[PDB]
Symmetry: C5
Subunit: 311 residues, 5 copies
């Protein structure tokens, strides 16, 4: 079979629409998500036109094999989509209405800069390669773009599912390609991070600061070193749920900065002891008394500065 | 092939039934479960009717290819079900009795609020898209809905497998869809959580409270900090077996609250020492003596309050 | 094609046999094992009978397509078995000898009560659904049931592979089903558990008891708390290799009971110190001296009681 | 199609050859390896003989469907090999030259006794089931058995890839089976184990022995217990990269034996303290002085004994 | 179908080109990467030639089935590539222009010597087996070799994608093979390693050196042993993200060398204490004072030496 013939030198417009049924498995490390949706296609093939009076029927159904169907592919998919044709319906003028149900693992990159308070725009790119007979251009039928109300992406809030109506028409391997951008706007459910990582991490830091109300070096060493190890465990736990980024993430910055607070606490604890031993407990007392105010104040201000730079 | 013709303008009723053979792999993190069941379908096709006297036979068997079979799909499945036809049997009036054995990874969400003392309702949604010739409506043949006695879901108790008999009939992409709800009610086997997480976690907390019967700061610091680290390990272990929820789980709340008890224990231990050093061991004694009663009482009451809010 | 016709009202006997080639991947957490075997089937179809004198040949080979083959399925498989037909041979009387090689992930539950000193009976259930023409019953041809000598299940000892010769005939969805039970009896290779978990766990416990020969509270606190943390690591390591059971496992019981020994050691260590501080080291000496005998004796007796209840 | 007819009562010889292209994913825990190779087959079928003068073509190419091809299977594979036919070439005498490229997950057991200084012989077993017309026997065409120079198995050194030329001809389910043994000899690259496990493990042990030059019980308890915990982590890390063996591995033995050294160090540390407290520091000094020589000497000799028993 | 006939004794040149659409999942442990690209093939088949005047058309489109297409395979792929034909276009002279879109898991080895400051050359090898009619040779059409601008390999910087234009022509199993080398040059994004592993690891080492400003043996033992355990955790974390190499990696060397610094710190701490006890605190003071300069200086120089050897 060959593509539909042009009335004049116009390109063939394939109207598209994606309707999400099930949306799942957003892997932060892999920057992938799995989708299960309907793909609807519509184009006019005058060769398929019929008189409803003579034929009796108002619409004609065809098997994919019987007629010409545009070779529509997804750009950013991992492997070729699993698709199964639901329906092909031809109206008297020759307007074909294709429907298929597909599933694919979509590869759309993520911006972890504000993690876990981040919002993402997932992309689904539809593309079509022009044949030698005629150029094929994609379009968006907005009435056939949507999502089910039940659509839930675990740990995420689905904001919108829309399409950039004007396609990106460009040359590739000496033939015209028409690309369409379907955007799924989502925002992370940060709630769990607060009682599981953020607050536990702050509690262990504040416990390290009880060393500023203790003259026992052996006890201080235990307090600051033990809590530093729990902070290492939280750093490791966090960096497992995330990929290696060439930039600093919000949680990454806080986690990093907290190491400096542990390092300065070890210095203060060491200075206090050296001075006590050197028979200068008065000077050690001044440093310890100052640290009690300095550490919380510098921690609070540094955090205001970070939140400001990141948001 | 085309769908059966209507006697009048009535829709075609496809009677359904699911009989679970094997139920397995409930992934809490993924909110998925795997099923292996029989799917039975029954509808009347007058075109297939025959006289049992003239034909000799009481029922006629057909291969799927020979006759019209309704396109039945699952809504909340991950990928398309794996199915294999067991039997197709036609009675003299034209009543078709289809049977297939399928397997699918079903995506039904879970409510972890009362974890690990939670009960779930897993869903299996059957759907059918109406064709242009006539509208197709689903029904439940209750005699063909059930589960095998051997059906075991590891770590769960299977309560019931029933179907909501009235289908959800709605419009989707300008065609009628008939959805059916099969509900598998299950309840978690919480027993293992008690000797593996709950009791070990309480033992480490009570060990931290032996610091209220000790005047040794060095020893107390070790007791409260070491046990706090073991509590961090239990928090991490628990949050690995669960997905990130936008709400507080029962175990999540207890685990979180226990951090506050560790934090206040560090404060008491610090106060006692500061006072002892400041040559006020009498005042430190009063605080330590009070803490011995305060800590268990506040822990017990806070737990009554939590159990009340959650159950 | 239709099933063989009955001489009288007797059911059709399909003689079966499974010969294991490769047996592997026993997942304790999932309660599954993978199998790679031969499935042999034999039934008489008089329609296929021939005279060896007239036909020249002693046996006739047929392709699955050509003749009627009973639809045999596995009950407890995860997905439908992967099978490939090796041979179909018809003798002059019409006796068909079918052979196929298959692989399947079999789902047979396990009893972890005596873990890691447990023995299991893995099951492979063959089933057949009766057609309307005639009822089909399964049988065991014992000469065609066996296993290869090389068959090795990693970490397990294969005791026997036998079949329960009388099938379980029952009604299901108003049709006779003939189920057969193939039993693979295996016993765990517990050897590795001894130097990797059991002996390391006992060594850390005995190290905690060196606190009964020490008056140093700071040192005792370190001894009992540090070793308690290593016991937590062993509890976590063990519960990862096992699923969540609604009953107590042997290792689970020992692991749990050992927590009580750590808890009582913390109490003794605390009592000794309180008494020493209260200027009563004589009374603290009596308690410490008693604990040196009490702890090993109670540990040894409690273990005799547990081994008795479990074996 | 039927198998080639015999000139006399001779069996049909299928000449085989495996040429490894890619060798990868050797899973120690699963005792599996993945292979990507060429499988070449050659047999004479006089029915395919042709005159090159009359036919125009020296050799004729056929699609697998067109002619009889022996059903060659792998014994020790997990699932059926993924294969794709490269070429089928028939010479005028009827000699068929089959070529296919396949990939399979081969299940060949491993001997971890000398781990990580072990050498393995991986096996690939080719088999063929005799048909009723005539018996089929396998052979090795040594010119068509080899491996690519680029063939690299991560963490292993590939020594040789050869075939045991004489097949194992045996009876199975009353039919002759011809098995062939392809052996891939490999040896582990132990180098990484030295700076990652062996040397770190020895360093922590030697650190524990600095307790023989210390009279501080509190410090010794910390030294021996802390380093014992690091040894537990190395034991856990090692047993994760390995399956549960019914025998003692070399690393397993060293790791186990080192626990006894930690246990005896705890005893010495306890004895020294008891004696110091009992006002017998002279006797405690003798024991501590002896331990300084005893511990390294017994460790060195025990290791000579182990290396001797294992190598 | 047979291959195109030669004008003379020349081989058939198949011009190739790979254009990367999506590049993803570079597994350091497995030494694999997943690719999703276009594969373009072009060769002359005079049998397909046509007069554009007589035929009307300028180019003729064919289905893969209709004409002869060279069997092109990838050498270093794991399983056979998943491919789907985009287009086949024949020009009047008989020049075929084939295009397919494929996905494959490519197995190309990596050099971890300079990890995480390493650069790699990933390879994609195209190959073709000569038929008996005529020899097939590969070529590079440079205009049809490229990559998409969006192509992102997580944690890596894509430098270039080029092809070694001269094929490797060699004999294999008595037939000519034409291999082509496509090279993807990438360099690791080391940035994340700095705040997550390198700086945390240096902070814990510097904390261990605060023992040179402390006379408290109990505190020093805690400082050096606790920080040594955190270094063990970083060693374990690092060796999990990497495969077992028969050579020393850059991070591996630094990590190893840091163990020696911990070992010597334990010796100094032990010597200081022995001397203090032996009533020689003056000599212990000299050693401690020297260590304060020696440790940072030797650490800094040893690192200069390592960076020099590795870069
Ligand atoms: C002057 C003391 C030098 C100590 C050097 C020790 C080097 C050990 C090399 C191991 C190589 C593998 C075996 C562990 C020994 C611990 C050393 C304790 C030193 C105590 C010194 C007392 C002060 C007089
Ligand atoms: C302990 C601290 C260890 C710090 C290691 C320094 C990195 C280094 O020295 O790495 C070396 C790389 C080299 O990059 P290249 O392009 O491959 O140079 C190849 C040069 N030839 C071809 C001439 C041989 O420099 C960097 O990436 C510099 C930035 C990283 C600084 C991180 C500091 C923390
Ligand atoms: Cl696609
Ligand atoms: Cl489905
Ligand atoms: Cl099955
Ligand atoms: Cl019954
Ligand atoms: Cl019946
Ligand atoms: Cl195979
Ligand atoms: Cl390929
Ligand atoms: Na078509
Ligand atoms: Na049908
Ligand atoms: Na059949
Ligand atoms: Na064949
Ligand atoms: Na072709
Ligand atoms: Na300590």
């Amino acid at each position: 079979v060959s593509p539909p013939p042009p009335i004049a030198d116009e390109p063939l417009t394939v109207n598209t629409g994606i309707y999400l049924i099930e949306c799942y498995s957003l892997d932060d490390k892999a920057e992938t998500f799995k989708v299960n949706a309907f793909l609807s296609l519509s184009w006019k093939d005058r060769r398929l036109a019929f008189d409803p009076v003579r034929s009796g029927v108002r619409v004609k159904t065809y098997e994919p094999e019987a007629i010409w169907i545009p070779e529509i592919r997804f750009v950013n998919v991992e492997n070729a989509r699993d698709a199964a044709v639901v329906d092909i319906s031809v109206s008297p003028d020759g307007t074909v209405q294709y429907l298929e149900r597909f599933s694919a693992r979509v590869l759309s990159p993520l911006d972890f800069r504000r993690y876990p308070f981040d919002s993402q725009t997932l992309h689904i790119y539809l593309i079509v390669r022009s044949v030698d007979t005629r150029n094929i251009v994609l379009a968006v039928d907005l009435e056939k773009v949507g999502k089910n109300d039940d659509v839930f992406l675990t740990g995420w809030d689905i904001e919108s599912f829309t399409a950039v109506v004007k396609p990106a028409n460009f040359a590739l391997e000496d033939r015209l390609e028409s690309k369409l951008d379907y955007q799924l706007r989502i925002s992370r459910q940060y709630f769990s991070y607060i009682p599981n990582i953020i607050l536990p991490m702050l509690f262990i830091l504040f416990i390290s600061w009880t060393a500023f109300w203790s003259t026992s070096y052996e006890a201080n060493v235990t307090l600051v070193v033990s809590t530093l190890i729990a902070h290492i465990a939280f750093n490791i736990l966090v960096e497992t749920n995330l990929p290696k980024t060439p930039y600093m993430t919000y949680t990454g910055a806080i986690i990093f900065m907290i190491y400096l607070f542990y390092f300065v606490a070890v210095i203060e604890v060491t200075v206090q002891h050296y001075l006590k031993v050197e028979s200068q407990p008065a000077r050690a007392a001044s440093i310890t008394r100052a640290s009690r105010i300095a550490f919380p104040v510098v921690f609070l201000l540094a955090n205001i500065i970070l939140a400001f730079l990141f948001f």
